[model samples]
Target: STGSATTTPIDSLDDAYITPVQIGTPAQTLNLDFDTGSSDLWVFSSETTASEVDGQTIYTPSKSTTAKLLSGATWSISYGDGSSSSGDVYTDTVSVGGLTVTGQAVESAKKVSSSFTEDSTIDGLLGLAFSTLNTVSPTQQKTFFDNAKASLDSPVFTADLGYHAPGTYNFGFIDTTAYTGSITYTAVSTKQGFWEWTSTGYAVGSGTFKSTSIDGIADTGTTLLYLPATVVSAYWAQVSGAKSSSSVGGYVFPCSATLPSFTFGVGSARIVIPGDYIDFGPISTGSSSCFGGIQSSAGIGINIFGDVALKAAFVVFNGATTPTLGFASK
Candidate 1:
């Protein structure tokens, strides 16, 4: 495993979403999350006055050689957590890793506060899903993808980074190489398009689980498989002595245990979540017991299956290749 060549965190190079953009005549640079699940771009502005903006990066036309903001359009976004920020709609010459995208649309946050200041240098969320969740409307109602589709080197951007390391989640770019796998595709149940999946039910006790299928949302940005309590308890029951340990938030451990691998069916496909990802490492069970990976989001509407759950699979979303979602091995 030491030779597994996993991508480790480098000198955290002042993390922010990085992309090539244009300003007026020449080109500029911008940092933003091209999120598929949501739409909207938000950055910390000079008006932002709080500790949240501390050490965060801000995009400025003067800083970049070629960057321009579009005229007559206003933009702002509010996170589900209630944090909000607003800015002016603008077009900039954008690029990433040398791939320059010209006349790309972006938002510059002129007003920022608590809600908009969660990440340092997190300029905005470049929602690149099927359609526009938030847009300037009528004229500019297209999502980032809709507006800048032609220039993309590849039709789709993938989220393959696994932050399964202990303490925190790993944040970084989409490993383009992780896409070439023999991925199995399934039809997503009709929804407004939430990356929802077609599940094949809950597996209780490893015996003969009458496959219970459920609809789920696929999110790499999220890091836990939020399941229904029934599904959760059923899973824990199979692990011999494994019991619900919400006392530490969700599941817990007693220093060490020989945990087995957990495999579940995604429609007709089965994925095995390795045990190492379970009790990743020892944590300070101090005032709060640290459960390394997934916790309880059981009653939280949707069931989220994250990285640990996606141990060694290469997933792909080829908007250019085909309409069907694709997955394969690296």
Candidate 2:
């Protein structure tokens, strides 16, 4: 049997996919951002300074009858964008949807940067990447999926993210009704603790798919598609007024600009991201400037197939011995 969960949108600048995850014995529900780019189940909690904790909810491990401190254990993590948090550890029973995992490691934050402190809606993040990426210094921890994988019927989880519509995350099983056509599975290389896969090539506008291999990660936490500098430059070049603005931090163009759909190669399959989806909203209020969802990862080394890219397809993060990623048209 597989468990399924629903993730809601906080509708913030980041526009992350949020889900309700039950933590501890008595089950305190926390709205968590489900991220695949990194691993570690961390939460804002009583340990955090009150001044630092704004509109976010905090988890209290001491209140749970089953919560036990993992003495001397602590976790610290920083995202690619440099948002960071650090905290102590607790072992508790965690439940999601209909599945339960006993003795799950939970990192509770005592210190958080403004990026997280300012996000009043997101209580913490639930990392869906491999357990190998868990950031507990001196001791690694398994992710919720890894801890629950053995009991899952198929050791697979499917992400069905809709554009402004309700989406569900299916664990341990694949729901065929959610997607169309055959699911194309691609081999994953997880050395960096990510669901890293290679896209054969890509195309901008309606052009023919080029034959250049792209190494990237499918990150739900990321709101945009960050590709290689060359790829990003080529795509934006087609848009008449697109300009690389350091002030905007990426390529920005007039909101009225005619955008082209972007496509990526996966074997014989192509995942096309609609143009409008690439318009990741405005750069500032009362301004015509809009940021391009697909930007250059010039310094990041790896490309990121984020929400702008993933929402266009039904994705499967398979946790089998040989992990693979599956994609299908929604």
Candidate 3:
């Protein structure tokens, strides 16, 4: 049977958008970051060091009759943001929305860094990247979506992410009602195991559109859009009273200023990110300055079109043999 599911964001999403997935036989529901950036279904679990887990639900394979160990298999992953988790492997049925994939590999965490342990809202991560990227050693595992796609009416999923609002992720089919106007499509390059693509270029705050080329990855797990340091600094220059704050990190601007719109070219169409969305949120309580949602991808080798960019458009991740990214106004 074909399947789909709706995933809601964590309360006050100043960061990542998450979804819930049930694991094991009878099922233990855990809220996880549905990451399209990586391919590893890992969770905080019984194997995790107790000291490393606080306020996060831990999955226990022993409690599920159907759970089986992958025998000596282990996994470890790190993100550009410095958040990381590692664990042993188990095979169990994993379900998202109404879609279910039995015998899916579920990596149960034995260790988690401070970044993940402190975030009580997420218990694990459900990766949506190609199964080729799965970290299970000797025997790479398949993602829940990869396993379910064979039986799907169409091998596709749509990400309708919202800012400080509820959004849904639908599998198997696209809901025309979720977006407006025509959906613009672009070819994706996945040689690096990411939804990598090139932007014709971008313009800062109604500025002239430059025909420069930029290679980047579309990542749902990342919170902000990271561009070249020089480009990011250029964008900051458009905002009056905006300063690169070492104390706050990134660029922060006076809250009262009306920010400029930033647009990126995709094929023949350009997706504009409004100024309001770029301001992000206040640096601190009662602070007059706000941090920018766009930052420098200086250290990282590639630009990341993270949540800040994706939420501005309705994204269709077509999972056919030749994957393509379809975008439309949300």
| Top of the candidates by lDDT | 2
Q: Over the stretch 77-174, how does candidate 3's per-residue lDDT look in tens digits?
A: 88767888888899998888878889999999999999888889889899998888888887888988889898778899888888777788888888
Per-residue alpha-carbon lDDT of model 1 for 171-224, expressed as tens digits?
A: 122354554534677665325545566667544324454487766656543445
The CA-based lDDT of model 1 is what?
0.50
Off by over 4 Å in 1: 1-34, 45-51, 62-65, 80-84, 111-118, 121-123, 135-141, 151-154, 163-181, 201-210, 238-249, 279-288, 296-299, 320-322
User: Which candidate number would show the highest TM-score if scored against the true structure?
Assistant: 2
Candidate 1: residue 127 lDDT (0-100): 60
| TM-score to true structure, per model | 0.71, 0.97, 0.96
Better of 2 and 3 by TM-score: 2
Q: After superposition, how far is residue 312 of candidate 1 from its true place, in Å?
A: 3.8
lDDT of 2 by residue, 1-330 (tens): 578889876774337878888988688999988899888999999999788899887899989999999999999998999899998999999888888999999999999999998988899999999888899977899999999999999998888887766688889999988988989999999888899999989999899789999999999999889998889999999998999999779999888898999999887898888888888778888889888888899887789999988989999999999999999987
Alpha-carbon RMSD to native, per candidate: 6.3, 1.2, 1.5
| Global CA lDDT computed for model 2 | 0.89
Clash list (residue pairs), candidate 3? none
RMSD of 1: 6.3
- The CA lDDT at 177 in model 3 is 88
Rank by TM-score, highest first. 2, 3, 1
Model 1 TM-score (2 dp) = 0.71
